[PDB]
Design a protein around this ligand. Structure first.
Ligand SMILES: Nc1ncnc2c1ncn2[C@@H]1O[C@H](COP(=O)(O)OP(=O)(O)OP(=O)(O)O)[C@@H](O)[C@H]1O
Ligand SMILES: Nc1ncnc2c1ncn2[C@@H]1O[C@H](COP(=O)(O)OP(=O)(O)O)[C@@H](O)[C@H]1O
Lengths: 55, 823, 50, 403, 400
């Protein structure tokens, strides 16, 4: 009922050598500038009205 | 395999020696190593034999008792690790080693040691500054060895790796300093900004030390530090260096405002003001016999209409520019403008001013009569002609400021536009406080139209180019904010970011504040403006990061149509790395792939960047590609290709290119929209009779002149969307070529400042030997008298060692003095 | 096998010497009786599988 | 003393730069990216017609798809051989077939002629489209030449030759008198021969002075070719083109291989030459005399084959010159100095005397050299540039005689 | 069938040091970064597509009509609506093509497709890749430049003027009304002649270049050596106007033999055709023919005449400075020594040409690499002279 869909068409930049040396300088700057409800309780303890499809 | 007999015998002897050294008792350890090391350090002034003994030698070195034995063991392990190196074991063993005189262990060893030292100097963390001093001492020991044994360029490599150019300065002597400085300058083009400014500063230090102030001024201009330029001009004192400095500032176009306390200040400020520029240029044109006014008709080759006649007038003005000798608009000029129709009288008068540019005295008198013309267009064109006339050339009394008094803020849109563009062209590079404080209030006017405000911004940017004028920027941003966005983002607000980029040209870094301030703007215009100002600020830097950002942003669909900024990204692609040949050729190839598989806007913009790469340089591949893409389906693409051919052939008189444009004119005779601009391209090709080139890279084609590149970029911003704007009204924007229009011949003076007839050898100057930082080698000595047109690829050289120039750089103006050995 | 015989009644398959693998699932091939026969690509083999 | 293995690797690791290996790896990466982007091409499709025909001509392709059932009569095209009295056509077909068909109802038998190529519809092989190919190879585009050769002052007028040939070429093209006053047809032929020089320039002048039925410069050395029958077909199509272009004159040039020498080595040294000779005679025999078309053959030596005695009936009026005297040489100087930026105040008669019998070709060459000397001096002026004119002409005469 | 080739290679030959240093390394880093950025840009442009529009209108209309089965056949002729094409096994179809019809790329004599069934043209293979009958433009516009050869300044200026009379300043002798395709007749010792090629690369910096060396004494009955070179310089006029370098053949193929008749036909055919093509009155074109040789004596009188074939240029032996320059050029790639032993190897030398200079430079490296492997082998100082003797200059009994 829910696709959880994403259309990115995004490819990472391949900066390698001097762009990456500048990226090292960028690192130099950038250095400073649900378990209790899932273990036991499966929904099997419900009550149903008289009209109820059950095998 | 059967080795040599004596080789095998010596191998067995060394095997016995290493077994002796690997024996149990250490009382024979010392004699064994004494024997061994002597022949170990023999071939370097052997190493093959000890190839399989890596582990045994490591064990022996570790087991050696501390002291002499241990440090010789470390010495031998180091000198062998150059072969048995899985790591910098050589340097670890040598740091453990003696640290005595190393240079005797062979050139290969010392060079490997220098390389490993550079590796460790880069590798060591910030907190580690203990061994850094021993590595620096080793470096200061090896540098003299390199200087003696002609290894100064790799010495510079290692010193720049370790950031010790400061002591490079102190160690280098002048006997080899020239090639070292040339190597530094070559590295400057590709090193990023911090170390780039560092190497520029160290080169200035070297030249100041060695009294090499003329080239030091070239380097300071590269540094674009006017404060340092003034400091070094004060530092130099001799009359010859003073006057060559004044020539260099005048040729660059930026006026240096100083005091009269200096000697011969009148001549210095005159030659900086380019007062004699026009006189010398006309004298050399006459000496070349290249003075006759070339008719646009016989340029057109008419052997086989209002806009077409306008284009003919414009190309006539381009051809006769800087000359002031054209009766076609002088005698019957009033008749021609009266016959002209609609909006073109302004452009015709501006073309007359183009003819009279750099001619202050004659141009002002011959435009005074047209100043009182009846038509508003003719009056505005006359005012713009005055601005063009005073553009570039500086004047003591500065007549343009007084001449444009009522028209500067005149209510009439066309008159105000003419005056504003004229003042921009005049004060371009002047950075004059009075002109700024008079034009920025005109920027603040609300009655002026959107395009009028854009022209005010253009004038302010070309005046304060590369100045980071904070009040100009604040006025720009305030005007943008006050103007509503809907009417802002239509077709003409593209001049405000241009002004911002001019004002922050060549600075970078600080552009973050400007873009953060501009972030409030809506996307369709903000995404264009921030990109424009960023690329203009980072022009001439080779920032692969910035250009790949531009590529990524133009890779988007962007399909109200905000995708226009893909065009400014395309222009910035060329603009960032246009400096040297690399970064321009490959960038051409990138433009080729853009045209190969690109959007309509992308292919509309590409020819603009193609022209920006190689303006006034007729590269055969560029010409062929532009010709092949001149017939594309998109009319704007065809227009941009036509103008790109015109620009790349501008100031060249390239005969085959002119023939190609004539064929294009025949092809496009049916459609006047392409026809008149093909005529325009031919006029660009023959502009100034080819005497003045348009490439903004001067001083041996490696200096970015801010005013010239500003005018050129304004023209290219207009040609981003001429398909609307040149068709509509912008017949005046084409007159920005005054800034980029500089003569490309040699004018020789003497110590008494008189024109010398000294002949020089001119021809292709390209590298032959790259063994070191050798000066560029010229071939093809087609020597003749001093007036010689200097094009790309080819340079000039003095015929004999008889006239010493003030600077080895041979272009524009130069003073030649008699050599003491001249006989 | 009978269906294989019926397929061989249409010669079954044709031997082709592949030369040019175009991007649009296209291979020129060469067939000894005639020669080049530009054709599409099969489903079991991609364009790059050629 | 080889001593290479291991030692070579050790010495290769011995020196180097500090980062020579780094540079090697980086340039390897450069080449790798180069090959990757050469594989990562732009328009990665060999077939073209991407959109300008594949957007509106593709819409018209929908119409041609709706009419795909017609326009399929291509199949194969073969020439026809002959026919019966009228209805049946007995044809040799490029499938070697003894092919006879009822010509397609849309095609009348009049249009189809023997030896013409027609396409046949595979279903019935009816004569559907009789294509008149008229296809010319590139060398034939050279055999045919330009019509408007432009008139001159009789191209350095040698009055004798031009005035002898005008009654033989110009007069018949005028057709003023050939019919009655003089015998039936004008002189049957004209052979404008002579040593390398004035030959065919007078022909070009006559072409200019005459109507649009203008000549073609065909070469016998190009006529003689490999294999058999190709020269015959080439001569045939030569006559066909000349006949079609307003019955223009056919200018055979350099007839010493088309006719060969006076001998064949053993009747097998050049028998293709004889095959060409037979068909050329069959073509230019005229059969029914016709003052419409003209033919001129020009060699430098009368090396024609045995038809040299039949041609008095066919190709008469052999004329020559190529012997410029003082007056002819100075007139050639005048017509050439009409070109360039020269004038005649130069005493060019002096140089005309200086060179005895220097053709018109060498006079044109001397004028070219004068212009070259002017541009070498960088002076475009040549009207008063007469002393320099004389100097360059005399020094180049010296060089031509002895260099 | 051939017009141009895609020149998207030769990435910036200007690596300034051409030796391993920081500057050269940084230049290579910028080059590889440019390659990375261009690949990334094109890939992002092609992947992050501007728009998704159906089957790009390809599979909808043209691809299906083209169909799956096809066959390759040459295109023969052209008609206003239909096209007349000669497909395989001598088939001929006159069919109009409207799907993927690119008329400019179609051309007669080119490979087109046939969709079988209802045989009609549906596409063309512009690649084809079989124009191999006579191939002489494969080496066109050689990359060699002026700087490759030095010390020949007079000859360089002369040839540059002789070939820049066109291109540059064509209106000069256009107004002079001569348009002279004079070509250049080059002398020179037999020890050179590829030096003549080197001085031709100066012109080869502009437009293309064709070469006919030795050819033959055209025994061929059709002759057509010079006539086919005429067709090929017509092709060069179609291309950028190329030069034709016929070094040696201008000497043997055009030999001033005193024999008149009964002599290889070339004398009949070849010289006459050479003159016919060298006279500007017959063939136009900025094509400049460079007839180089090493035997000035065998200059035929027709070739002798500057009237048709002007611009005679003599290549002399290198001087002392020229020898210095050429040795510097040839040893610059190899870092001969640190002592720079330059003038000792040439001061007493006489009659040494460019080929010998290249040979001795190569053999010095060979002999060092043999066993004296020492990088800048200190032995190089005298071993350059050692392999400079190398005997092999000349040997003929004693006779003296
Ligand atoms: N009488 C003349 N007047 C002017 N130019 C002449 C004359 N005769 C020959 N020439 C020149 O000679 C050259 C070739 O002339 P022409 O066309 O007559 O000969 P061709 O076809 O080359 O052959 P051939 O020289 O064997 O007759 C041209 O440059 C032409 O100007
Ligand atoms: N002066 C020179 N400068 C640089 N290179 C030269 C020079 N002379 C010859 N060469 C090079 O050496 C090669 C051989 O030239 P050359 O001596 O003419 O050979 P050959 O004698 O076989 O004709 C040429 O290809 C050229 O590149």
């Amino acid at each position: 009922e829910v696709p959880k869909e994403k259309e990115k068409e995004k490819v990472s930049t391949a900066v390698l050598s001097i762009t990456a040396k500048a990226k090292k300088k960028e690192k130099e700057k950038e250095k400073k500038e649900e378990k209790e409800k899932k273990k036991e309780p499966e929904p099997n303890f419900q009550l149903l009205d008289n009209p109820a499809r059950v095998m | 395999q059967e080795l040599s007999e004596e080789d095998k015998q010596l191998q067995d002897e060394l095997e016995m020696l290493v077994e002796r050294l690997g024996e149990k008792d250490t009382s024979l350890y010392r004699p064994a190593l004494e024997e061994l090391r002597r022949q170990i350090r023999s071939s370097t002034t052997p190493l093959k034999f000890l190839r399989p003994h890596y582990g045994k030698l490591k064990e022996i070195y570790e087991n050696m008792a501390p002291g002499e034995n241990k440090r010789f063991a470390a010495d031998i392990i180091s000198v062998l690790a150059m072969t048995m190196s899985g790591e910098r074991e050589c340097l670890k063993y040598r740091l453990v080693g003696s640290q005595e005189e190393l240079a005797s262990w062979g050139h290969e060893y010392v060079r490997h040691l220098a390389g490993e030292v550079a590796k460790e100097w880069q590798e060591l963390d910030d907190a580690e500054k203990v061994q850094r001093e021993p590595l620096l001492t080793l470096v200061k020991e090896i540098v003299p060895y390199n200087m003696a044994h002609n290894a100064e360029h790799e010495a510079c490599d290692l010193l720049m790796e370790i950031e010790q150019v400061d002591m490079l300065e102190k160690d280098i002597d002048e006997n080899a300093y020239a090639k070292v400085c040339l190597y530094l300058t070559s590295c400057v083009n590709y090193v990023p900004e911090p170390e780039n400014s560092a190497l520029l500063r160290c080169a200035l230090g070297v030249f100041r030390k060695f009294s090499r102030f003329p080239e030091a001024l070239r380097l300071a201009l590269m540094l674009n530090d006017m404060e340092l330029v003034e400091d070094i001009f004060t530092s130099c004192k001799d009359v010859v260096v003073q006057k060559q400095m004044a020539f260099m500032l005048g040729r660059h176009g930026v006026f240096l405002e100083l005091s009269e306390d200096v000697e011969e200040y009148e001549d210095l400020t005159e030659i900086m003001s380019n007062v004699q520029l026009n006189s010398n240029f006309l004298a050399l044109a006459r000496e070349l016999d290249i003075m006759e006014p070339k008719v646009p008709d016989d340029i057109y080759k008419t052997h086989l209409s209002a806009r077409m006649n306008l284009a003919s007038s414009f190309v006539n003005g381009f051809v006769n520019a800087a000359f002031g000798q054209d009766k076609l608009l002088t005698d019957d000029g009033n008749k021609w403008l009266y016959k002209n129709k609609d909006h073109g009288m302004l452009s015709a008068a501006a073309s007359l001013g183009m003819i009279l540019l750099w001619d202050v005295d004659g141009g002002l008198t011959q435009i005074d009569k047209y100043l009182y013309s009846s038509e508003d267009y003719i009056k505005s064109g006359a005012l713009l002609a005055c601005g063009i006339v005073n553009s570039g050339v500086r004047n003591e009394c500065d007549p343009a400021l007084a001449l444009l008094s009522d028209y500067v803020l005149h209510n009439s849109n066309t008159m105000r536009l003419g005056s504003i563009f004229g003042l921009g062209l005049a004060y371009a590079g002047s950075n004059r406080e009075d002109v700024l404080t008079l034009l920025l209030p005109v920027m603040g006017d609300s009655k002026s139209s959107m395009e009028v405000a854009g022209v005010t911004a253009l004038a302010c940017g070309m005046i304060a180019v590369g100045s980071c004028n904070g009040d100009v920027t604040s006025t720009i941003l305030q005007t943008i904010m006050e103007k509503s966005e809907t009417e802002l983002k239509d077709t003409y607000a593209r001049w405000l970011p241009l002004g911002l980029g001019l004002n922050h040209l060549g600075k970078g870094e600080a552009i973050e504040a400007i873009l953060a301030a501009l972030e409030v703007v809506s996307e369709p215009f903000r995404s264009f403006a921030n990109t424009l100002v960023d690329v203009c600020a980072y022009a001439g830097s080779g920032n692969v990061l910035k250009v790949q950002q531009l590529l990524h942003i133009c890779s988007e669909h962007f399909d109200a149509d905000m995708g226009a900024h893909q065009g400014v990204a395309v222009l910035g692609i060329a603009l960032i790395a246009m400096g040297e040949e690399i970064g321009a050729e490959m960038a051409l190839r990138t433009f080729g792939h853009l045209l190969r598989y690109g959007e309509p806007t992308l292919r509309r913009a590409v020819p603009l960047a193609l022209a920006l790469i190689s303006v006034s340089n007729p590269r055969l591949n560029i010409l062929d590609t532009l010709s092949k893409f001149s017939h594309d389906a998109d009319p704007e693409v065809s227009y941009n290709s036509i103008f790109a051919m015109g620009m790349v052939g501008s100031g060249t008189n390239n005969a085959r290119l002119a023939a190609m444009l004539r064929q294009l004119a025949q092809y496009h005779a049916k459609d006047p929209n392409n026809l008149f601009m093909v005529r325009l391209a031919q006029g660009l090709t023959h502009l100034g009779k080819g005497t003045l080139t348009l490439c903004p890279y001067h001083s041996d084609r490696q200096l970015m002149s801010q005013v010239a590149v500003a005018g050129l970029l304004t023209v290219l911003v207009s040609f981003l969307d001429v398909r609307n704007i040149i068709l509509g009204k912008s017949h005046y924007v084409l007159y920005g070529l005054v800034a980029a229009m500089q003569p490309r011949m040699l004018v020789t003076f003497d110590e008494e400042l008189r024109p010398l007839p000294v002949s020089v050898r001119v021809g292709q100057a390209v590298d032959v030997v790259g063994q070191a930082g050798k000066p560029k080698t010229i071939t093809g000595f087609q020597t003749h008298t001093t007036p010689v047109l200097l094009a790309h690829g080819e340079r000039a050289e003095l015929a004999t060692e008889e006239f010493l120039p003030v600077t080895p750089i041979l272009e524009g103006f130069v003073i030649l003095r008699k050599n003491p050995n001249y006989d | 096998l009978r269906e294989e015989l019926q397929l061989l009644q249409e010669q079954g398959s044709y031997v082709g010497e592949v030369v040019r693998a175009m991007d649009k699932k296209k291979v020129l091939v060469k067939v000894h009786p005639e020669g080049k026969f530009v054709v599409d690509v099969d489903k079991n083999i991609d364009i790059n599988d050629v | 003393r080889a001593l290479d293995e291991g030692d070579i690797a050790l010495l290769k690791t011995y020196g180097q730069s500090t980062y020579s290996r780094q540079i090697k790896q980086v340039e390897d990466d450069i080449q790798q990216l180069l090959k990757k982007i050469n594989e990562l091409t732009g328009i990665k499709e060999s077939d073209t017609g991407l959109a300008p025909p594949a957007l509106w001509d593709l819409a018209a392709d929908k119409q041609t798809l709706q009419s795909e059932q017609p326009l399929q009569v291509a199949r194969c095209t073969k020439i026809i051989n002959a026919d019966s009295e009228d209805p049946k056509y007995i044809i040799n077909v490029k499938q070697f077939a003894k092919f006879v068909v009822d010509l397609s109802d849309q095609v009348a038998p009049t249009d189809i002629e023997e030896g013409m190529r027609v396409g046949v519809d595979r279903n019935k092989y009816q004569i559907h489209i009789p294509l008149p190919p008229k296809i010319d190879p590139t060398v034939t585009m050279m055999q045919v030449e330009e019509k408007p050769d432009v008139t001159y002052s009789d191209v350095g007028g040698c009055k004798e030759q031009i005035e002898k040939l005008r009654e033989v070429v110009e007069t018949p093209l005028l057709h003023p008198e050939r019919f009655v006053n003089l015998g039936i047809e004008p002189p049957k032929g004209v052979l404008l021969f002579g040593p390398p020089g004035t030959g065919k320039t007078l022909c070009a002048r006559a072409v200019a002075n005459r109507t649009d039925a203008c000549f073609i410069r065909v070469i016998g050395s190009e006529l003689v070719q490999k294999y058999v029958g190709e020269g015959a077909r080439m001569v045939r199509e030569l006559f066909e083109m000349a006949r079609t272009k307003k019955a223009c004159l056919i200018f055979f040039d350099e007839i010493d291989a088309i006719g060969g020498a006076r001998f064949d080595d053993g009747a097998g040294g050049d028998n293709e030459v004889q095959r060409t000779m037979l068909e050329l005679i069959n073509q230019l025999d005229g059969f029914d005399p016709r003052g419409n078309i003209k033919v001129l053959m020009a060699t430098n030596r009368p090396d024609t084959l045995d038809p040299a005695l039949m041609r008095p009936g066919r190709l008469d009026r052999k004329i020559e010159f190529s012997l410029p005297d003082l007056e002819g040489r100075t007139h050639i100087f005048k017509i050439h100095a009409r070109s360039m930026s020269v004038e005649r105040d130069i005493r060019f008669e002096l140089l005309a005397r200086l060179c005895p019998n220097s053709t018109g070709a060498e006079i044109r060459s001397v004028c070219t050299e004068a212009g070259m000397f002017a541009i070498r001096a960088r002076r475009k002026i040549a009207t008063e540039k007469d002393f320099l004119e004389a100097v360059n002409k005399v020094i180049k005469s010296y060089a031509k005689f002895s260099a | 069938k051939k017009t141009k080739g895609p020149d998207a290679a030769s990435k910036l030959p200007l690596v300034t040091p051409h030796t391993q240093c920081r500057l050269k390394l940084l230049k290579l880093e910028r080059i590889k970064d440019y390659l990375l950025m261009e690949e990334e840009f094109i890939r992002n442009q092609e992947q992050m597509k501007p728009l998704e529009e159906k089957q790009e209108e390809e599979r909808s209309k043209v691809d299906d009509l083209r169909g799956t089965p096809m066959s390759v056949g040459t295109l023969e002729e052209i008609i206003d609506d239909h096209a007349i094409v000669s497909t395989s096994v001598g088939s001929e179809h006159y069919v109009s093509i409207l799907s993927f019809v690119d008329k400019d790329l179609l051309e007669p004599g080119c490979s087109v497709l046939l969709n079988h069934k209802v045989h009609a043209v549906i596409g063309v293979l512009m690649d084809d890749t079989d124009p191999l009958v006579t191939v002489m433009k494969v080496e066109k516009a050689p990359q060699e430049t002026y700087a490759d050869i030095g010390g020949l300044d007079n000859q360089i200026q002369e040839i540059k003027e002789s070939v820049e009379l066109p291109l540059t300043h064509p209106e000069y002798y256009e107004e002079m009304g001569i348009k002279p395709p004079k070509g250049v007749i080059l002398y020179g010792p037999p020890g050179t002649g590829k030096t003549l090629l080197a001085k031709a690369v100066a012109n080869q910096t502009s437009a293309t270049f064709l070469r006919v060396v030795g050819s033959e004494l055209i025994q061929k009955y059709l002759g057509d050596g010079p006539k086919l070179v005429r067709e090929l310089f017509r092709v060069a006029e179609e291309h950028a106007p190329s030069i034709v370098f016929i070094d040696e053949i201008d000497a043997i193929g055009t030999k001033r033999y005193d024999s008149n008749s009964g002599g290889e036909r070339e004398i009949q055919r070849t010289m006459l055709e050479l003159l016919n093509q060298l006279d500007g009155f017959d063939s136009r074109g900025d094509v400049k023919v460079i007839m180089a040789t090493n035997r000035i004596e065998t200059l035929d009188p027709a070739l002798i005449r500057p009237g048709r074939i002007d611009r005679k240029i003599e290549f002399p032996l290198p001087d002392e400075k020229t020898k210095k320059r050429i040795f510097q050029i040839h040893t610059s790639r190899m870092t001969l020594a640190d002592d720079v032993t330059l003038d000792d190897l040439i001061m007493a030398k006489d009659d040494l040409s460019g080929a010998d200079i290249k040979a001795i430079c190569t053999e010095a490296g060979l002999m060092a690499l043999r066993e004296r492997r020492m990088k800048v082998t200190n032995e190089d100082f005298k071993k350059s002279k050692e392999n400079v003797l190398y005997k092999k200059q000349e040997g003929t009994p004693e006779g003296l």
